[PDB]
Every structure is written in structure tokens, then in C-alpha cells.
Amino acid sequence: DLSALNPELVQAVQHVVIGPSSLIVHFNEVIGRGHFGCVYHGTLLDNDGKKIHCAVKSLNRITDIGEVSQFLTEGIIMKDFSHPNVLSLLGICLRSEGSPLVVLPYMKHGDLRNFIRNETHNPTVKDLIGFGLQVAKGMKYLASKKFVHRDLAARNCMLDEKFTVKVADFPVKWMALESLQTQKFTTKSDVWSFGVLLWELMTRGAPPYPDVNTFDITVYLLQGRRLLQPEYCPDPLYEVMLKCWHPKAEMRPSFSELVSRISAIFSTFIGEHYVH
Amino acid sequence: DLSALNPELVQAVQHVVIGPSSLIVHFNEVIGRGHFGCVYHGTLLDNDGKKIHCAVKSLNRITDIGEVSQFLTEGIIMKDFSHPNVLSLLGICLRSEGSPLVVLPYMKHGDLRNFIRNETHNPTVKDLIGFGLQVAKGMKYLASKKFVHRDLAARNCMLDEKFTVKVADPVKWMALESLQTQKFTTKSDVWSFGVLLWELMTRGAPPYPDVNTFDITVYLLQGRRLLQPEYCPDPLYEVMLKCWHPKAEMRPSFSELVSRISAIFSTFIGEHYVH
Ligand SMILES: COc1cc2nccc(Oc3ccc(-c4cnc(Cc5ccccc5)n(C)c4=O)cc3F)c2cc1OC
Ligand SMILES: COc1cc2nccc(Oc3ccc(-c4cnc(Cc5ccccc5)n(C)c4=O)cc3F)c2cc1OC
């Protein structure tokens, strides 16, 4: 269905909606085939007149008004976000035929997890601390706007041509302890997941807790067990991680703290293959 | 936490928000305990300043910008609804020093399930079918608005002073395709409605008492449905069975259910609760 939604909500959404006659979607050029879904090359004609290469995702799941309306306000929220470490939303596209589209700036190097995993790239310790730093900044911003990411992981972080990490939103082994029992998600719950993301970065994309089942994780963490220090991770950076994995959310560091702390560490390091 | 939300959204929500200077909540006067959590007696002054007796629920979970924003958009949807068989929303209240409040018209006889389980009440077969017909009418309207309910059940239906049923807002009610795809449609609602009809005719007996919550999926796959209630007419049990057709599109629409149940209901005499 097109737009049989509440007039005031539709009015609120217009600045996020892209006119389809200003978008081309190349459904024959697929960007990635993974947990991302179906992502295609797009070309967006912006109001000033700049033709922009972009990524377009089709949202195959939406149907009822409730879903679309949920989706639209989610669009409004992300549109208001402005930060070099947070992925921008260019807009959403509502169509009479087919499910809605999400339009995003093109990220040359794809998601951070794939980038660090493949042998062709040789990021140093500093590069990986750097990437982790940028995520912390991204999350430091999001936290300020009192937004809870809820799904932080290296796969959900993007990397542009200038090697700027862009946190995107798009998982029991990434969740805080209390998220697994009380279903509570907070800014501090995101801090836990950031910890796991750091582990991912310093392992160059190893799967976390490889020898435990998804259901056994809860008791595992309650045995006081934690992720083991990655081969690239320096002693002071591993201490940071462990703080992010404290069972009492309040004990865990804020994202503002992690930024200045990780930044301190980052500066002790030299030798970089991917800058900025 | 103040409106640190999007200004354009706040503009759209304005017609649903209640100024707290026009609301008194009696936090000592609890209306219902359990399932609906903590509901309180309230008094609202409408646009024109009339006192309206209401029920007020506190939303203890809603905290971050995303949650509040969703809550607001859902309020915008509910507020637009206008049908005698759907619980209307009087408004929402965003407190600076407390979690948000939902404000609803006071329903004398509480939820439909609690009302029928009570042995003090004596609803006839015609009475139970009549209630089923009203849910159907509400769900018909909801369907016409392309709105999927997702949690249709007797416990989610309210009953006012004039004995009007008001549809308001879980695996044993879930459709076969819902339990394996996480997919909800109005056809999925039709299923839950069938289970609701079963609830009415059994006067609020718990469905599938012997099969465990996890075992339900294989049970319906095997082919077993709920047995015919002791005091359920045959043409109505037939209806339920149609509502439980494994092929989603083969199930009837709420519009047809209104027509059919209306006929079945019209063939009966004897009501202790007249709508
Ligand atoms: C060359 O390699 C790649 C380049 C890419 N370049 C840009 C974007 C890419 O992927 C995406 C990253 C994030 C999203 C995405 C973001 N935000 C939301 C929330 C949301 C909700 C409601 C309204 C609006 C937004 N969703 C639901 C999303 O799906 C979609 C994407 F396609 C790329 C992927 C690539 O390889 C896999
Ligand atoms: C005399 O006895 C009773 C009288 C009652 N009289 C009116 C309402 C009652 O219960 C409720 C019925 C429904 C709701 C309710 C409705 N719709 C939504 C969606 C929603 C989402 C987002 C924004 C706005 C709305 N929610 C989240 C709700 O909680 C809350 C209630 F408290 C009563 C309960 C009674 O005893 C059990």
C-alpha cells in the first residue's frame, strides 16, 4: 500500500522521503550478499543537482500500516543524526509496487568486519585501535542524543574511502548480561557490546566465544568467564574491555570515558597503514 | 526526559498528548492487577473541560528516544481509530519526572475473559456469540485500516457499562505461519479470533491445557485443533475451524465472519446482557 497513513505523520516524514523520480536503483548490480540482505547500487539526484552514487537496500518484511509507520519514525530519528562516525541516512523511498527502500551513502570498503578479516589488508595494532576509537566516538554522539543502538557489532560498522568508520544500525554473544535475563537495553548495554566489538577488532574478525552454544552463554558469563585477550590487543586495551564486561551496568565505563581513554592509548602507538 | 525528540514528530504528536494540568491520577486507586500491570483510576478534562472518568496505565519500560518515539507514533495511529468496538485512546501524558502515561476511557466490567470466568455472571450462549460478533466488527474495522492486531485474545477485550466489547491491546493464540516465520497478517489475526471464540464458548478456559508452550508448533502441524466446546453450537465450531485453516488465504475475512456469526447469533433467543 502507498500512503494511507496519518496525515500529520506523513507530514512529519516528508523531509526523509525521496521522490522516486530522483532515484535510480540498479537491481542487477548487487553490492553484498550476506546478513546485509539485498543491497544495490543506486544513483540519487539531489535537490541541488548533484548526482550521487549510493547504496539502496530493499526492506522485504514490511506490509501493514504499523510496520511502515514504525519504519518512518525510525527514518526521522536517523535523519537527524549528524556525525562523521555515524552513517548518514540520505532518505527513504516509498513505492506503490514493492517494499520500501533505504538509501545510504556508498561505503567503498564495506563493513569493518569483512575488511579486517581478509588477508589482502594488513592493518596494524594502531589501525585496529584507531577503528575502535572511531566507533567509540560514534557511540559517544549517539549516547548524547540518548539513543540506544541495541545491536552493536563489527559487521554493523561501515568504512568509507577515507577509512572513516561509520556506525550503522541495520545476537546473544554481543549482549550485556542483564539484556539476556531482564531484556533491558541501555546506553551501558551498548557499552558491553562495544567491548565485544573491540575484541573483534583486535582479533581481526574472529567469531566471539567460538566454543559455546547460543543458549549456554548466559551461565558461561555467570561463571565469571570472559573473552580472552586477542593477539593484537595491548595490556591496557584489554583492561578497557574487561570494564565493559562488568555485570553491573553502572560499573561499566561511559562512552565519553572510553573515547578519552582509548585515545590516550592510541597516541602511544605509531605505524599506520590506514589513516583518518 | 524532555522532548529531545524530533520537532516535526512532536508537531505530529501534539493532538494525542494530554497536558498534565488536565489530569489527576489516583496512584492509590488501582483498577486492575495482573496482565495489564499497574492501571490507575484517573480523571481527565476534555477539550471543552468536561470531567471524564478514565483508566491510566504507566509505561515503566519506555525510556530512550527510540522507545518514546515509537510509543508516540503508535499513539498517533490508535488516536485516529474511531469504531464502537475498538478501545479509543483519550491521549498520552509525557511526564518530565516520570515514565509516560496512557489514558483510556473507563471500562466498567474490565476485560472480557475476567468477566466470563466469574461464576457470579450468567452469560447465555447467545450472549457469548454476541460478544464474539462485536470483536469481529472491531477487527473488521481494524482490517479495513490495514492494521494488524498481533495479540487478539479474550483478555485483551474490554467491556463497558452498556456491555459493549472494545478490542484493545501469546503462542497458543498464534497462527501456524506466525509460529515459524514470525509473520503477522490480518489472516493471522483471524486465527487468534478463532481461539478467542473458543475462549468465549468455554467461558474463559485456558486453551491447550495439556500441551506445553514449546510443543504447540508440532501439535498444530500434526493436525490437532482445539476440541469443540461443550456448549458451542455446531455452525460456530465450523467457523473456528475455518479460522484455523493452515493455508492463510483459505481462512475467512472478518467481513465474512461478521456476516456469518451475525446469522448464527440471530437464530438464538435469550440474553442476560443486552448490547
Ligand atoms: C561496498 O560494500 C558496501 C557498501 C555499503 N555502502 C553503504 C551501505 C551499505 O550497507 C548498508 C548499511 C546499513 C543499512 C541500513 C542502515 N540503517 C537502517 C535503519 C533504518 C530504519 C528505518 C529507516 C531508515 C533506516 N537499515 C534498516 C539498514 O539496512 C543498509 C545497507 F545497505 C553498504 C554495504 C556494503 O557491502 C555489504
Ligand atoms: C474496571 O476494570 C478495568 C477497566 C479498564 N478500563 C480501561 C482500560 C483498562 O485496561 C487497559 C486496556 C488497554 C490499555 C492499553 C491500550 N492500548 C495500548 C496501545 C498504545 C501504545 C502506544 C500508545 C498508546 C496506546 N496500550 C499500551 C495499553 O496499555 C491499557 C489499559 F490499562 C481497564 C482495565 C480494567 O481492569 C483490568
Verify whether ligand 1 is closer than 6 Å to residue A55 (CB atom): yes
Per the structure block, which three cell numbers stand in for A195?
567491548
CA distance B128 to B120: 15
Domain B8-106 fold is Phosphorylase Kinase; domain 1 (3.30.200)
CA distance B53 to A21: 51
CA distance A174 to B132: 45
B138 contacts B184 by C-beta, under 8 angstroms: no
Contacts of A192 (CB under 8 A, 6+ apart): A174, A175, A176, A177, A179, A244, A245, A252
B135 burial level (CB within 10 Å; 0-12, 13-18, 19+): buried
CB neighbour burial string for B67-81, b if at least 16 within 10 angstroms, e if fewer: ebbbbbbbbbbbbbb
Spell out where chain A is interrupted, by the residue before each break (C to N > 2.5 A). 170
Per the structure block, which three cell numbers stand in for A147?
539513543
Active site residue B80: no
Q: Which of B6, B15, B146 has its CB closest to that of A8?
A: B15
Contact B6 A12 (CB under 8 A): yes
Experimental method: X-ray
For cell 496512584, the residue is: B27
Residue among B13, B15, B17, B36 to mutate when testing ligand 2 (max atoms within 8 A of CB): B36
**Residue A195 marked in a binding site:** no
CA distance A190 to A74: 18
Instruction: Report the separation in Å between the CA atom of B36 and the middle of ligand 2, taken as the mean of its atom positions.
Output: 7
Beta-bridge mates of residue A47: none
Judge whether A146 is closer than 8 Å to chain B, CB to CB.
yes
Verify whether ligand 2 is closer than 6 Å to residue B166 (CB atom): no
A152 contacts A170 by C-beta, under 8 angstroms: no
Pairing of β B38-45 and β B23-33: antiparallel
Encoded amino acid at A61, one letter: R
CA distance A131 to B28: 53
Q: Which residues of A touch B77 (CB under 8 A)?
A: 6, 65-66, 69
Judge whether B65 is closer than 8 Å to chain A, CB to CB.
yes
Encoded amino acid at A41, one letter: H
Contact A65 B76 (CB under 8 A): no
Angle at A129 between CA A54 and CA A179, to 5 degrees: 80
Q: Which residues of B touch A187 (CB under 8 A)?
A: 64
CA distance A42 to A46: 12
Closest-CA residue, ligand 1 atom 25, reads: A75
Q: Which of B12, B145, B184 has its CB closest to that of A65?
A: B145
H/E stretch holding B39 reads strand B38-45
CA distance A92 to A76: 10
Verify whether ligand 2 is closer than 6 Å to residue B31 (CB atom): yes
Verify whether ligand 2 is closer than 6 Å to residue B102 (CB atom): yes
Enumerate the domain spans of chain B. 8-106, 107-275
| CA distances to A251, B20, B42, B222 from B24, in Å | 38, 8, 6, 53
Which amino acids of B are annotated as binding site for ATP, given as ranges?
A: 31-39, 57
User: Nearest-CA distance from B142 to chain A in Å?
Assistant: 11
Phi, psi of A7 (to 5 degrees): -45, -45
A143 contacts B4 by C-beta, under 8 angstroms: no
Nearest to B1 by CA among B79, B78, B75, B59: B59
A59 contacts A105 by C-beta, under 8 angstroms: no
Contact A65 B147 (CB under 8 A): yes
Q: What is the CATH code for B107-275? A: 1.10.510.10
CA distance A245 to B60: 26
For cell 566507533, the residue is: A135
Per the structure block, which three cell numbers stand in for B187?
489472516
User: Nearest-CA distance from B231 to chain A in Å?
Assistant: 36
Encoded amino acid at A148, one letter: V
Handedness of CA B130, B136, B138, B144 (dihedral sign): negative
CB < 8 Å & 24+ apart, contacts of B92-97: B92/B13, B92/B16, B92/B17, B92/B18, B93/B17, B93/B18, B93/B20, B93/B23, B93/B56, B94/B3, B94/B17, B94/B68, B95/B20, B96/B1, B96/B2
- From the CA of B37, the nearest ligand is 2
CB < 8 Å & 24+ apart, contacts of A174-177: A174/A208, A176/A249, A177/A218, A177/A221, A177/A222, A177/A247
DSSP A140-174: HHHHHTT---S---GGGEEE-TT--EEE----GGG
For cell 540518548, the residue is: A146
DSSP A40-60: EEEEEE-TTS-EEEEEEEE-T
For cell 501469546, the residue is: B170
Out of B48, B64, B151, B215, the active site residue is: B151
DSSP A224-267: T--PPPPTT--HHHHHHHHHHT-SSTTTSPPHHHHHHHHHHHHH
Contact A186 B66 (CB under 8 A): no
State this model's resolution in angstroms.
Answer: 2.6
Q: What share of chain A is helix, strand, coil (3-state, %, to 5)?
A: 40, 15, 45
Contact A186 B63 (CB under 8 A): yes
**Catalytic (active-site) positions of A:** 151
Contact A64 B8 (CB under 8 A): no
Beta-bridge mates of residue B103: B56, B91
Q: Does the structural domain A107-276 have CATH classification 3.40.50.150?
A: no
